[PDB]
Write a protein that binds this DNA or RNA. Structure first.
Ligand SMILES: [Mg+2]
Ligand SMILES: [Mg+2]
Length: 96
RNA sequence: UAACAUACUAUGGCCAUGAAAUUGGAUUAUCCAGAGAUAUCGGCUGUAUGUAUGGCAGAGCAGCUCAGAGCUGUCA
């Protein structure tokens, strides 16, 4: 429930971007508050992103699932290896 | 209108920019996309048994003369 609900929330109230380019760009520009990576993420991206985040001190969430679960979770109809939560109004996770 | 010379075009693939849900794009057929589709006075690249010029008209071809030389057209 934590994840599904949290993200559903984040989507309703908040701003996020899906995908690799938008996620990295988000880290770069500093807009990225929280980063999600899937089980299916190609390694190179998993480690690359992991690095961009450590360096920018953003917190990375490793999802419990694969592309479909992510996309579905975000109430989108497309698959996503990596995702960025920008601003979520009501969800606790952003803060902890 | 030869190989060959130079410059351009050629079913595909790439690079930017930006991301797509009232999902779109696309083939006769399939098929592709947030693992970034579509789209930009956008850009790069690959293949001619393509185009232009050189070759080349002087050659070849078709006619017409002169007593071996000569003339005309070979176009769009
Ligand atoms: Mg082309
Ligand atoms: Mg002649």
């Amino acid at each position: 429930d934590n994840i599904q609900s949290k993200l559903a929330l984040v989507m309703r109230s908040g701003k996020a971007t899906l995908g690799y380019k938008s996620t990295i760009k988000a880290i770069r520009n500093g807009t990225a508050k929280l980063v999600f990576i899937s089980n299916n993420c190609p390694t190179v991206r998993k480690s690359e992103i992991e690095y961009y985040a450590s360096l920018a001190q953003i917190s990375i969430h490793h999802f419990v699932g694969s592309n479909v679960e992510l996309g579905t979770a975000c109430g989108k109809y497309h698959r996503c290896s990596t995702m960025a939560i920008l601003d979520a109004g009501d969800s606790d996770i952003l803060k902890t």
